[PDB]
Structure formats: C-alpha cells, structure tokens
Amino acid sequence: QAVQPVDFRHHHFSDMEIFLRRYANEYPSITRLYSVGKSVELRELYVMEISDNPGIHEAGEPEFKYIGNMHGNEVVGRELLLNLIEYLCKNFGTDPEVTDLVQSTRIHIMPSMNPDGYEKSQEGDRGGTVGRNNSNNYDLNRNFPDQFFQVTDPPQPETLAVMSWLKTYPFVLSANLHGGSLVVNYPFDDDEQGIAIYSKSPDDAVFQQLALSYSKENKKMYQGSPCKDLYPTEYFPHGITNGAQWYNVPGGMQDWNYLNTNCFEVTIELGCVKYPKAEELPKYWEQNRRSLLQFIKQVHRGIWGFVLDATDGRGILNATISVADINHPVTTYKDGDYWRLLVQGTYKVTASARGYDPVTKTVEVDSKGGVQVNFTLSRT
Ligand SMILES: *[C@@H]1O[C@H](CO)[C@@H](O[C@@H]2O[C@H](CO)[C@@H](O[C@@H]3O[C@H](CO)[C@@H](O)[C@H](O)[C@@H]3O)[C@H](O)[C@H]2NC(C)=O)[C@H](O)[C@H]1NC(C)=O
Ligand SMILES: *[C@H]1O[C@H](CO)[C@@H](O[C@@H]2O[C@H](CO)[C@@H](O)[C@H](O)[C@H]2NC(C)=O)[C@H](O)[C@H]1NC(C)=O
Ligand SMILES: N=C(N)NCCS[C@@H](CC(=O)O)C(=O)O
Ligand SMILES: *[C@@H]1O[C@H](CO)[C@@H](O)[C@H](O)[C@H]1NC(C)=O
Ligand SMILES: [Zn+2]
C-alpha cells in the first residue's frame, strides 16, 4: 500500500540536483537539502536530511546516514538513495512505517560522494574502472588515514568535506554503497600484515548482526553467490564478509568512521554489474528496498540515554560510555545523549567524564530493541 518510486533512470548531476531540489521544495517540513563541500570539478556534495525536524539535532534522537557513488562508476547506490529520498518523502504521513521512521531518526542521505567520477563513467560498464577515481585520479576509498598502512595519496576535497561532515553530526550507524559484488562488508578492511585474512574489530559481534540485517532482506545476496560466472571464486556465507578477509583495503572510509568517530559504518555491494543499463534499475530497488529500510532501524538497537550532572541535572558533553569487554568507547553529544549499538546480551556499562565521578550499571539488551539507560554523575 506504500507508494513506490516511479522515477527509475540514471540521474546525471544536473538532473540529480533538479531531483533533490524538487523534494526539498515539495516537502520543506521534513527535508533539508544542504552541501557539505564541492568536488574537484566544483560539483556540490549534496546531502538530503530527512526527519520531522529538519536542521536540528534533537536530544536522544539518533543520527543515521547513507552514502553512495564514492566510486564514480558504481552507480546503483546513487540511484537507490534517490529512490529512497522519494519513497520517504512521498510516504511520510500516510505510511505508518515511514512516518514512524522519519519521526524517530534524523536521516542524512548523500547520493554521490564522487559526482565528477560519475560523469566520466560509461553506462553498461560491468567491471571497469573508468570514472572510479576522482577528478585528480585518486581512489577516494584509499584516501582516508589508515590505522595500519600509512596513506600517501594527497587528501582530496571530497574526502576532506566528508571527514568534516562526519565530525559535524553525532552519526551512530552508517553505510556507504558500492558495486562490483553482492555482499555487505564490515570492519576491519585491512590488517597489519596487509593480506587477505580475518581482521576482527572490538565490535565484530554487532557488525555481523548489522551486516546481516541488510543481506538477509536481499534474497540473492543472502544466498552468498554474487555472480557465479563473473567472479566464480566469490562465496559469502549469508551475504556478509569481513573486509580484510575478502581482501586487504587500506585507507577506506568505512574503518575511518569507526576509528575516528562514534559512527559504525558498513560497506554494501549492491551487485556485480557496476553500471547496469537504466532498464535494470527498478529491479535493484525492488531487491533492496526492504534491506535499506531494515538497516536504518538497526540504529535503534543496543543502549541509549543520557549522562547527566547530579547538580545541574543537565547532560554532560563529551562524556564516555565504556562497555564490559569491548575496547571501543563511545562519547556523548551536546545534550549529554549517547547511543551504543550492542548485540543481545548483558553488559557492565560505565559512564565517566572529566571532572566527575564514574558510574557503572549492569544493563541488559534483548533480541528486539534498544534499552534506555541514563547515568547521573556527581562532580569531583
Ligand atoms: C586510482 O587512484 C589510485 C590511487 O589512489 C591508483 O592506484 C595507485 O596506482 C599506482 C600506479 O599503479 C601505484 O603505484 C605503483 O605501486 C607499485 C606497487 O608498489 C610500484 O611497483 C610502482 O612503482 C608504483 O609506485 C599505487 O600503489 C596505487 N595506489 C593505491 C592506493 O592503490 C589507481 O591506479 C587509479 N586508477 C586508475 C585507473 O588510474
Ligand atoms: C533519564 O534522563 C532522560 C533525559 O532527561 C529522561 O528523559 C526526560 O524524561 C522526562 C520525563 O519523562 C521528560 O520531561 C524530558 O523531556 C525527557 N528528556 C528528553 C527525552 O529529552 C529519562 O526519562 C530519564 N530516565 C530514563 C532512564 O529514561
Ligand atoms: N575491504 C574490502 N576488501 N572490500 C570492501 C569494499 S571496498 C572495495 C570494492 C569497491 O570498490 O566496491 C574497494 O575499495 O574497491
Ligand atoms: C573529549 O573527550 C576525550 C576523551 O574521551 C578527550 O581526549 C578530549 O580532549 C575531549 N574534548 C574536549 C572537551 O576537549
Ligand atoms: Zn567501490
């Protein structure tokens, strides 16, 4: 009964800009179109914010984000996110799922992180590299500071704009879209040895559940065989894979997220054909709609709440949330609010902060959703 997208076709920059503006102009109450910077060839890195309170962070409200077309010729992601912009705007108010989603989450959608590369891409290209890098011929997904390999390529304008953007909002969950395979890729993307081996992150548990939440809804992806005749060597149990194990990739945007912010980012491969003919687009939406939707909901799982000041009674900014045996702490935002993605289990969470006395609580996360837990810390 929900309204499906109708605008199925490839959108070159000009038309994407026209497209985005259309929704921002037609649904001003639940949208906010903004730019986070420009590409080498001066194209806007547009982001579409969608929520019932566009332009403001609401205390306790999770910041989510989708990013596509980081590699110019991997187009499916770009179109799906445009399809998603449409689906969300057109269904808000009439569709209970979309309404409830847009009201409880602040969704940021960037259709193309490499618009210059896109323009240099050839429709029909299945596995080529023309249009992949940015205007200066650098791989944006090799451009981020890496925890193991020492990155040499000069930081590009698209990379910088995005790093800034990631520092701007309290992003909790994220996913950047690619093409060239069919699987959801999770951290870490590389290892100290720089080879194809499993590279576990402190949050390996959640990442597998987060990745599975998407692949499970994409029937063909879940089957585990991206394209038996094109890349016969590829087999991903249940449609997910640790980055490094598939193959070593240093300088990725995915790991940079986890290691430099509170955001947990996953990389999604939407299909073996990088730049399919426009006639195939509607099928990709049909096969990923439920996935795109279910993934966003994962942002509401785990634990969340506030770290307040016993005297003031108001949130503490930049407080820390440490969990049982997971060496990856999370920080609080301006209203002392935090979100910590965790798998079903029991944890010993500890809120702490400069100038206050730490509190520890035994929290319990279930298989269904998120539990609210606040921490009131006394001063020192
Ligand atoms: C897209 O941009 C990336 C850079 O971000 C290009 O990859 C880089 O390609 C150069 C040339 O192949 C590589 O340098 C060479 O490395 C080998 C291996 O050590 C060395 O023997 C050569 O003397 C030379 O230094 C470089 O390693 C590689 N960098 C990365 C991050 O992969 C890529 O070629 C670009 N794509 C296209 C189609 O131009
Ligand atoms: C823990 O702290 C939060 C932050 O104040 C509490 O949320 C407030 O709840 C009261 C009463 O329900 C409201 O008047 C405030 O507007 C809420 N603040 C928000 C959501 O911004 C929360 O109820 C407290 N207790 C827990 C653990 O839920
Ligand atoms: N960590 C690994 N091995 N893969 C993650 C997907 S990014 C990869 C594939 C893509 O470009 O789509 C790339 O950087 O080229
Ligand atoms: C925020 O907290 C971190 C520790 O988690 C600290 O290193 C950093 O300096 C703090 N930022 C501020 C408020 O200066
Ligand atoms: Zn890619």
UniProtKB/Swiss-Prot annotation:
<feature type="active site" description="Proton donor/acceptor">
    <location>
        <position position="269"/>
    </location>
</feature>
<protein>
    <recommendedName>
        <fullName>Carboxypeptidase D</fullName>
    </recommendedName>
</protein>
<comment type="similarity">
    <text>Belongs to the peptidase M14 family.</text>
</comment>
<feature type="binding site">
    <location>
        <position position="74"/>
    </location>
    <ligand>
        <name>Zn(2+) 2</name>
    </ligand>
</feature>
<feature type="domain" description="Peptidase M14 2">
    <location>
        <begin position="9"/>
        <end position="299"/>
    </location>
</feature>
<feature type="glycosylation site" description="N-linked (GlcNAc...) asparagine">
    <location>
        <position position="374"/>
    </location>
</feature>
<feature type="binding site">
    <location>
        <position position="71"/>
    </location>
    <ligand>
        <name>Zn(2+) 2</name>
    </ligand>
</feature>
<feature type="binding site">
    <location>
        <position position="178"/>
    </location>
    <ligand>
        <name>Zn(2+) 2</name>
    </ligand>
</feature>
<feature type="glycosylation site" description="N-linked (GlcNAc...) asparagine">
    <location>
        <position position="133"/>
    </location>
</feature>
<feature type="region of interest" description="Disordered">
    <location>
        <begin position="112"/>
        <end position="137"/>
    </location>
</feature>
<comment type="subunit">
    <text>Binds to pre-S, hepatitis B virus large envelope protein, via the carboxypeptidase-like domain.</text>
</comment>
<feature type="glycosylation site" description="N-linked (GlcNAc...) asparagine">
    <location>
        <position position="318"/>
    </location>
</feature>
<feature type="compositionally biased region" description="Basic and acidic residues">
    <location>
        <begin position="117"/>
        <end position="126"/>
    </location>
</feature>
